[PDB]
C-alpha cells in the first residue's frame, strides 16, 4: 500500500466529506443542498431599483413604533452604543459575502428598511426577527432584563454577537435548518449544527467538532460555510471583498475581528470568504497540532480545535503557514506556498508548482500523483534537510521502490538524484511511465540523498 504519512493526508482530506451517505442516522447534505434548505421559505428582499444590489437602510429606534404596546413586549429601550457597534459589525459580515448593502439612516424612496430595538418582557423570547415577506419586514428585537443579560454585552465570540448575526440572517430571508421540546434528534439533515450554520439551534458537539469545554462558550461571530452559500444564492456573491492579497489568522490583514488572532489561546471559528488575490492562512502562532486544508469548501482543525475553520465554496486560498506543532498541510490545484514551521509536519502540495518549507524538525513532503510535480511545473523544497526530511512517493509507487541511476535507461521506475555544490540545488527526476525521460521532477534547495526518499 502506501506510507502512514500519506494515509493521514488522505484520511483528513475526506474527514468532513458531505453528501450521499447517512451520518448519525440522518442524511448528509452538501453545501448546495443546505443553501436550498435554508432558503426554503421563498422570502427575500427585491431589487426595486434594479441596480444589481439590495440597498437597505436601518435605524436604531429611539421611540416605540405605532402599536408597540400591543406587542406585549414590555418596556421599550434603544440600543446602547455597544449594541450599535456590534450590530454594525454583524451587518458588515453579511455585506462582505453577498451583494447587499446596509446604510444607517431613515427609510427613503431604498429596497427596504430595517429597525433594531430592545424590549424587557421575557415572554417575548431572547430575540426575534421577521422575514422580508412579512408586514414587519426588516424588524429584529432583543430581550434585555435582569434575568437575561446576554444581549447587553455582545462581543466577538459570545452568543450576544452570534444572536445579532443570526437574527439579521432571518431578516435577509434565512430560516432555521429545520422546522423546530425539540433536540438535534429532530434535525432534517446531519450538518444541522452551529459548526456549519449560525442559524442552527444545536451545538457543534452533535457533529463531533470540539470548540471548547464545559463552562466556557465559543460561538462563530460571522456567517459560516452554509450561511454564506445560502445568502449568495439569494443575492449573489460579493467578489469585491478582499479582492487583493489577504492574510487571515495571525498577522491578519482582513480587518475583521473574527478573522484575527493575536494569542496562542485564541479560539478561532470562521469561514473564509475572499474575492481574489494571493491569500494566506497564517496559523503560525499556535503550538497545538493542526490540520490545514486549502481545498475550497473544506474544513481545517486549527488552534487545538477541530472543524473550526473552513473555506467557502468558490474561494481559492493560495498559502498556509503551520505552527510549532506537528501539522498536516494540504494544498490545492493552485501553486501554493506551504510552511510547516517547527515540529514534524506532513506537507502535500497537490497540483501545480508549489513552494514548500518544512521549517525546523523532521518533515515529510508527500506526493499522491505524478501530476503533482512535473518537469513543466515542479515543486521546490526551499529548505530540505537530508537525513531528517523525507520525500514520500509511496502513493505513486505503492511501495514498489525506485531504481536510482545516473541516466534513464528506458525502464519504468528509473530515478535520478542530482546535486550542485556551488548552488546548493538538489533534484529528483523519475520516469514512472518508462519512456526514457523524466515525467516527475522535484527541485530542492539543499542536498537530497537516495535514503531521503520513501517509495
Q: Which residues bind Ca ion (CB under 5 A)?
A: 47, 49, 51, 55, 111, 242, 246, 274, 277, 279, 316, 322, 327, 331, 336, 340-341, 343, 345, 349-350, 352, 354, 358-359, 361, 363, 372-373, 379
Q: Decide whether 202 or 440 has the Cβ nearer to Ca ion.
A: 440
Residue 169 annotated in ligand binding: no
Q: How far is the CB of 352 from Ca ion (least distance, A)?
A: 4
Residue 55 annotated in ligand binding: yes
> CA 144 to CA 121: how far, in whole Å?
8
Residue 21 annotated in ligand binding: no
Q: Decide whether 109 or 213 has the Cβ nearer to Ca ion.
A: 109
Per the annotation, the verdict on 167 as an active-site residue is: yes
Q: How far is the CB of 21 from Ca ion (least distance, A)?
A: 28
Q: How far is the CB of 183 from Ca ion (least distance, A)?
A: 39
Select which of 85, 92, 156, 167 is catalytic. 167
Q: How far is the CB of 266 from Ca ion (least distance, A)?
A: 17
Q: How far is the CB of 52 from Ca ion (least distance, A)?
A: 7
Which residues, in sequence order, are CB contacts of 276 under 8 Å at separation 6+? 239, 243, 244
Residue 215 annotated in ligand binding: no
Residue 96 annotated in ligand binding: no
Q: How far is the CB of 130 from Ca ion (least distance, A)?
A: 20
Residue 139 annotated in ligand binding: no
Q: How far is the CB of 294 from Ca ion (least distance, A)?
A: 8
Q: How far is the CB of 375 from Ca ion (least distance, A)?
A: 12
Residue 431 annotated in ligand binding: no
Q: Decide whether 143 or 321 has the Cβ nearer to Ca ion.
A: 321
Q: Decide whether 61 or 430 has the Cβ nearer to Ca ion.
A: 430
Q: Decide whether 227 or 363 has the Cβ nearer to Ca ion.
A: 363
How far the first Cα of the chain sits from its last, in Å, is 10
> CA 240 to CA 64: how far, in whole Å?
37
Residue 343 annotated in ligand binding: yes
Q: Decide whether 107 or 150 has the Cβ nearer to Ca ion.
A: 107
Q: Decide whether 110 or 191 has the Cβ nearer to Ca ion.
A: 110
HEC states along 248-295?
A: EEECCCCCCHHHEECCCCCCCCEEECCCCCCCEEECCCCCCCCEEECC
Q: Decide whether 143 or 441 has the Cβ nearer to Ca ion.
A: 441
Residue 341 annotated in ligand binding: yes
Residue 170 annotated in ligand binding: yes
HEC states along the chain?
A: CCCHHHHHHHHHHHCCCCCCCEECCEECCCHHHHHHHHCCCCCCCCCCCCCCCEEEEEEECCCCCCCHHHHCCCCEECCCHHHHHHHHHHHHHHHCCECEEEEECCCCCCCEEEEEEEECCHHHCCEEECCCCCCCCCEEEEECECCECHHHCCCCCCHHHHHHHHHHHHHHCCCCCCCCCCCHHHCCCCCCCCCCCCCCCCCHHHHCCECCCCCCCCCCCCCCHHHHHHHHHHHCECCCCCCCCCEEEECCCCCCHHHEECCCCCCCCEEECCCCCCCEEECCCCCCCCEEECCCCCEEECCCCECCEEECCCCCCCEEECCCCCCEEECCCCCCEEECCCCCCEEECCCCCCEEECCCCCCEEECCCHHHCCCCCCEEECCCCCCCCEEECHHHHCCCCCEECCCCCCCCCEEEEEEEHHHCEEEEEEECCCCCCCCEEEEEECCCCHHHEEC
Sheet of 309-311, strands arranged across: 270-272, 309-311, 299-300
Are 76 and 9 a contacting pair, CB within 8 Å? no
Residue numbers in the known binding site for Ca(2+) are 47, 49, 51, 53, 55, 111, 242, 244, 246, 274, 276-277, 279, 316, 318, 323, 325, 327, 332, 334, 336, 340-343, 345, 349-352, 354, 358-361, 363, 372, 379, 389
Binding residues: 47, 49, 51, 53, 55, 111, 166-167, 170, 176, 242, 244, 246, 274, 276-277, 279, 316, 318, 323, 325, 327, 332, 334, 336, 340-343, 345, 349-352, 354, 358-361, 363, 372, 379, 389
Which positions are annotated as active-site residues? Answer: 167
Please enumerate, by residue number, every residue annotated as part of a binding site for Zn(2+).
Answer: 166-167, 170, 176
Amino acid at each position: 500500500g502506501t506510507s502512514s504519512a500519506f494515509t493521514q493526508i488522505d484520511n483528513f482530506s475526506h474527514f468532513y466529506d458531505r453528501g450521499d451517505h447517512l451520518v448519525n442516522g440522518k442524511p448528509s447534505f452538501t453545501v448546495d443542498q443546505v443553501a436550498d434548505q435554508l432558503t426554503r421559505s421563498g422570502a427575500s428582499w427585491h431589487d426595486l431599483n434594479n441596480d444589481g444590489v439590495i440597498n437597505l437602510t436601518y435605524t436604531f429606534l429611539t421611540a416605540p413604533p405605532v402599536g408597540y404596546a400591543s406587542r406585549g413586549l414590555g418596556t421599550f429601550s434603544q440600543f446602547s452604543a455597544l449594541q450599535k457597534e456590534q450590530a454594525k459589525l454583524s451587518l458588515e459580515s453579511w455585506a462582505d459575502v453577498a451583494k447587499v448593502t446596509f446604510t444607517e439612516g431613515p427609510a427613503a424612496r431604498d429596497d427596504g428598511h430595517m429597525t433594531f430595538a430592545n424590549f424587557s418582557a421575557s415572554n417575548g423570547g431572547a430575540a426575534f426577527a421577521y422575514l422580508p415577506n412579512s408586514s414587519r419586514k426588516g424588524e429584529s428585537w432583543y430581550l434585555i432584563n435582569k434575568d437575561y443579560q446576554v444581549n447587553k454585552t455582545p462581543g466577538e465570540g459570545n452568543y450576544g454577537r452570534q444572536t445579532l448575526t443570526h437574527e439579521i440572517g432571518h431578516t435577509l430571508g434565512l430560516s432555521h435548518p429545520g422546522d423546530y421540546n425539540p433536540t438535534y434528534r429532530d434535525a432534517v439533515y446531519a450538518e444541522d449544527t452551529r459548526a456549519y450554520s449560525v442559524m442552527s439551534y444545536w451545538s457543534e458537539k452533535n457533529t463531533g467538532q470540539v470548540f471548547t469545554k464545559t463552562g466556557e462558550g465559543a460561538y462563530a461571530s460571522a456567517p459560516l460555510l452554509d450561511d454564506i452559500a445560502a445568502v449568495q444564492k439569494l443575492y449573489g456573491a460579493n467578489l469585491e471583498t478582499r479582492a487583493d492579497d489577504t492574510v487571515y489568522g495571525f498577522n491578519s490583514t482582513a480587518d475583521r475581528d473574527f478573522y484575527s488572532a493575536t494569542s496562542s489561546t485564541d479560539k478561532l471559528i470562521f469561514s473564509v470568504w475572499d474575492g481574489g488575490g494571493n491569500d494566506t492562512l497564517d496559523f503560525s502562532g499556535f503550538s497545538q497540532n493542526q490540520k490545514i486544508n486549502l481545498t475550497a469548501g473544506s474544513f481545517s482543525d486549527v488552534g487545538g480545535m477541530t472543524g473550526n475553520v473552513s473555506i467557502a465554496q468558490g474561494v481559492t486560498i493560495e498559502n498556509a503557514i503551520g505552527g510549532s506543532g506537528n501539522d498536516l498541510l494540504i494544498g490545492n490545484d493552485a501553486a501554493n506556498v506551504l510552511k510547516g514551521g517547527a515540529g514534524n509536519d506532513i506537507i502535500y502540495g497537490g497540483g501545480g508548482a508549489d513552494v514548500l518549507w518544512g521549517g525546523t524538525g523532521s518533515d515529510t513532503f508527500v506526493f499522491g500523483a505524478v501530476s503533482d510535480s512535473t518537469p513543466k511545473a515542479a515543486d521546490i523544497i526551499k529548505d530540505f534537510q537530508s537525513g531528517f526530511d523525507k520525500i514520500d512517493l509511496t502513493a505513486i509507487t505503492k511501495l514498489g521502490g525506485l531504481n536510482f541511476v545516473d541516466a534513464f535507461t528506458g525502464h519504468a521506475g528509473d530515478a535520478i538524484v542530482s546535486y550542485h555544490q556551488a548552488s546548493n540545488a538538489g533534484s529528483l527526476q523519475v520516469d514512472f511511465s518508462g519512456q526514457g525521460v523524466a515525467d516527475f521532477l522535484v527541485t530542492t534547495v539543499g542536498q537530497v540523498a537516495t535514503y531521503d526518499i520513501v517509495a
